[PDB]
């Protein structure tokens, strides 16, 4: 794999006027989808991680905001990074986004980690724009390779046995961490159950126990659900994304949970800001926020 060349061409459009693309060779990308896929299957499905690192929420193809993130927090391995799914769809440059991440993953597999989102799934990114982007710029079979790569993504992580990181949130079927480790890869996302709720569920201010999710999929949960889950597993914080927030960060249940969103002006239909939780080795968490004019 001629990796340093690929990463170089991906960062060549930094400073250019936004909207300019990066088109890699069809083979080069397919190499990323295989080399990264192997690294995923080697590392645990439940990532045991050590601070210090930076955690970023949804990107959703917004590639120039992602470049603004690294330009702010430092290009790897200057910092470590954890990403919470939703790399593709909605944005115009999903291919530039996902490739630069998968390249860094292969580049520094012990200091760069990508978690699965509800859009890293064929049935979803078929609808919202990653499929039309692959068919246009390349072909269909490349999308199927992407799918085979997405299936083997890791699901959740735990930063020093205290912070719990998943895309969506909690599941009623999750009572022990071994239920996560026993999940096999490759895997599609089933419409119901544990794996589905980890990428689709949402924190609800209005309900206390569990409730029906307006997405038509998974469940909501309340401030009571967060207090019991952190206590039973001896955890202090739950970190997730999956939902847009005004400041880029937004606490829940007396700072027990935080929602991260790293895409400013989410698909040109919001005034929102992008944020990024910088955690030093002592598990002290302060945010870095992106914002337009």
């Amino acid at each position: 794999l001629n990796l340093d060349s690929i990463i170089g061409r991906l960062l060549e459009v930094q400073g250019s006027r936004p909207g300019k693309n990066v088109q890699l060779t069809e083979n080069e990308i397919r190499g990323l989808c295989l080399k990264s896929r192997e690294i995923f299957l080697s590392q645990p499905i439940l990532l045991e991680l050590e601070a210090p690192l930076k955690i970023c929420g949804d990107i959703h193809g917004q590639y120039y905001d992602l470049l603004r993130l690294f330009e702010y927090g430092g290009f790897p391995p200057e910092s470590n990074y954890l990403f919470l799914g939703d790399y593709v769809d909605r944005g115009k440059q999903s291919l530039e986004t996902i490739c630069l991440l998968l390249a860094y993953k292969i580049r520094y597999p012990e200091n760069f980690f990508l978690l699965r989102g509800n859009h890293e799934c064929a049935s979803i990114n078929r609808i919202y724009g990653f499929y039309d982007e692959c068919k246009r710029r390349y072909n269909i079979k490349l999308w199927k390779t992407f799918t085979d790569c997405f299936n083997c993504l890791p699901i959740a992580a735990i930063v020093d046995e205290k912070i719990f990181c998943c895309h969506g949130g909690l599941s009623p079927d999750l009572q022990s961490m071994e239920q996560i480790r026993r999940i096999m890869r490759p895997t599609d996302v089933p419409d119901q159950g544990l794996l589905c709720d980890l990428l689709w569920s949402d924190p609800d201010k209005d309900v206390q126990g569990w409730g029906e999710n307006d997405r038509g999929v998974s469940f909501t949960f309340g401030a009571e659900v967060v207090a019991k889950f952190l206590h039973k597993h001896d955890l202090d914080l739950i970190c997730r994304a999956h939902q847009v927030v005004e400041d880029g960060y937004e606490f829940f249940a007396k700072r027990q949970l935080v929602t991260l969103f790293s895409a400013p002006n989410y698909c040109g239909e919001f005034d929102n800001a992008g944020a990024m939780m910088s955690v030093d080795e002592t598990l002290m968490c302060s945010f870095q926020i992106l914002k337009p004019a």
Partner: peptide, 19 residues
């Protein structure tokens, strides 16, 4: 042996970096 999660805002330092 086991560290704890402490916010910078909670511990007397600014929470937010603007750019």
């Amino acid at each position: 042996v086991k560290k704890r999660v402490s916010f910078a805002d909670n511990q007397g330092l600014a929470l937010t970096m603007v750019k």
